[PDB]
Amino acid sequence: LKVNQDGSQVRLRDVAKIELGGESYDVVAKFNGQPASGLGIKLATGANAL
Amino acid sequence: GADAETVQNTVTQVIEQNMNGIDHLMYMSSNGDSTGTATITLTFESGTDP
């Protein structure tokens, strides 16, 4: 990010906390109190639902 | 400026995943060139209105 006057360098880790996380934390889904995530399936046109 | 491996993972796989489910789809094929071009060819059942 920046190079100091003394010659030291400022890395991103020095000013921030980098880690993998979700895109959005607005929605928290739980199934029976356990963390969960679901995917919804829509039927194709003219397809036997069963 | 994307290699063949990058193209397959980044564009072709994403596009193909959504393309599944279109009406009267017979089969799909794809190719990712070293030039970065990705070509998804969708062949539909005969008699389908193009």
Residue of B17, B23, B45 for testing the chain A interface, max A β-carbons within 10 Å: B23
Residue with tokens 């003219």: A46
PDB resolution in Å: 3.0
Solved using? cryo-EM
Q: Please name which of A42, A49, A29 lies closest in space to residue B18, comparing C-alpha atoms.
A: A42
Give kind and range of the element (H or E) at residue B5: helix B4-7
- Show Cβ contacts of residue A18 under 8 Å, excluding neighbours closer than 6 positions: A12
Show the tokens assigned to B37.
Answer: 């071009």
Q: Please name which of B5, B50, B8 lies closest in space to residue B29, comparing C-alpha atoms.
A: B8
CA–CA dist B50, B44 (Å, integer): 8
- Show Cβ contacts of residue A48 under 8 Å, excluding neighbours closer than 6 positions: none
Q: How many residues does chain A have?
A: 50
CB B15 within 8 A of CB B38: yes
CA–CA dist B4, B11 (Å, integer): 11
B21 vs chain A: nearest CA distance in angstroms? 6
CA–CA dist A37, A27 (Å, integer): 10
CA–CA dist A27, A3 (Å, integer): 40
B41 vs chain A: nearest CA distance in angstroms? 21
Neighbour tally for B31: CB within 10 Å: 13
| Residue in chain B nearest A44 by alpha carbon | B21
**With contacts defined as CB-CB under 8 Å, which chain A residues touch B21?**
44
Q: What is the dihedral of CA B16, B12, B15, B35, to 10 degrees?
A: -140
Show the tokens assigned to B44.
Answer: 């539909």
Between chain A and chain B, the number of residue pairs with CB atoms below 8 A apart is: 4
Residue with tokens 């193209």: B7
